[PDB]
Amino acid sequence: DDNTLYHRGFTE
Amino acid sequence: SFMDRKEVVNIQTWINKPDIKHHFPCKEVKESGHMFPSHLLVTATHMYCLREILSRKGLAYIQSRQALNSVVKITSKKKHPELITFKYGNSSASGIEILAIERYLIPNAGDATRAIKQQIM
């Protein structure tokens, strides 16, 4: 299981 | 060499190129579990991965070259936070289209991803 560090469209 | 299996270049020569905004030692991780000492080289528009050629000091394969604009997700593992997965493809409201995935074990995971992320935006 993982941690989002960047997700185009969502984390900006 | 010009090609060993892929294109062979001189790691140092590349690090000093003007385009290069960042540079990060790491090891690519395969599903098989094998790991390959490499160097992620980040430009204003691309991210290269140079795979060190062990038997030839200071030389690397150009193992891949992705467009920052095609990065859609970057995750770190919880159990091992220096293991950074890169996910490439297309992203919209409805969801995500995954075309390629690269996994690197990166020494300064935090600094690295923050540098790449800053380029991406």
Author numbering:
A (entry chain B): 255 to 266
B (entry chain A): 556 to 676
Text of the article:
The amino-terminal domain of TBC1D23 binds to the golgins, and the carboxyl-terminal domain of TBC1D23 captures the vesicles, but how it recognizes specific vesicles was unclear. Binding is via a threonine-leucine-tyrosine (TLY) sequence present in both proteins next to an acidic cluster.
Peptides corresponding to the relevant regions of syntaxin-16 and CPD showed robust enthalpic-dominated binding to the C-terminal domain by isothermal titration calorimetry (ITC) with affinities of ~1.4 and 10.6 μM, respectively, and a stoichiometry of 1:1. The previously observed strand-exchanged dimer was absent with the homodimeric C-terminal tail–mediated interface being replaced by the peptide. Thus, the structure elucidates how the syntaxin-16 peptide binds to the C-terminal domain of TBC1D23. The peptide extends TBC1D23’s β sheet by adopting a twisted β augmentation mode of interaction with strand 5 and buries ~670 Å2 of the C-terminal domain’s solvent accessible surface area, a similar sized interface to those seen previously for other trafficking motif–binding proteins that have a similar KD of interaction. The Thr212 in the acidic TLY motif of syntaxin-16 packs its methyl group against the alkyl chain of Lys628 that orients the hydroxyl group toward the solvent to stabilize a somewhat strained backbone conformation. As a result, the acidic residues Asp209 and Asp210 of syntaxin-16 are in close proximity to three basic residues (Lys632 to Lys634) in the C-terminal domain of TBC1D23, which would allow a direct electrostatic interaction. Lys672 of TBC1D23 hydrogen bonds via its amine group to the carboxyl peptide bond of Lys213 in the TLY in syntaxin-16; mutation to alanine (K672A) weakened binding ~20 fold (KD ~ 30 μm). The structure indicates that recognition of the acidic cluster and the TLY triad are the critical factors in driving peptide binding and specificity.
